[PDB]
């Protein structure tokens, strides 16, 4: 019982660790880069006005 639960736990832990790795190292950079772009465009428009 112990070792069967151990291997199932290993499967679960590797998949969830992979998921958190993916979301953290993928989703965020695009988000803050778009934040930089949007603030830059807003400031440019204001200076032109």
């Amino acid at each position: 019982s112990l070792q069967t639960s151990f291997v199932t736990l290993d499967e679960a832990i590797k998949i969830t660790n992979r998921r958190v790795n993916a979301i953290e190292h993928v989703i965020i950079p695009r988000i803050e880069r778009t934040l930089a772009y949007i603030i830059t465009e807003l400031d440019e428009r204001e200076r032109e006005e």
Binding site: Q3, T4, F6, V7, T8, D10, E11
Partner: protein, 110 residues
């Protein structure tokens, strides 16, 4: 209630385990064990191992060290959970902790 331990090994271990209470013949009269000796062929033992893997009434399988070594390739190919596999010592093969697939699954965490 219905699930049973299957054991493949030498004569002493199977004797002691059949004494322990495991052992059934299904409706088709097929044993849940196979006795190994000097004149037991490799193809037959791996074939019967495959047959036991297919069967859905075992759950637990026990193998002594040397038989596992001789069929290590299939055990390493095995990547399931419900058909659990364990290891046991033997009379002339004292157990060593450096040979088992479950440790390969968690290699380095010794």
């Amino acid at each position: 209630r219905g699930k049973l331990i299957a054991v493949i090994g030498d004569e002493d271990t199977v004797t002691g385990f059949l004494l322990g209470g495991i052992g059934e013949l299904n409706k088709n009269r097929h044993p849940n064990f196979l006795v190994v000796e000097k004149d037991t062929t490799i193809n037959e033992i791996e074939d019967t191992f495959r047959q036991f893997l297919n069967r859905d009434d075992i759950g637990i399988i026990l193998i002594n060290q040397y038989i596992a070594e001789m069929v290590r390739h299939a055990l390493d190919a095995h990547q399931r959970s419900i058909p659990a596999v364990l290891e046991i010592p033997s009379k002339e093969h004292p157990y060593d902790a450096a040979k088992d697939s479950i440790l390969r699954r968690a290699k380095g965490m010794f």
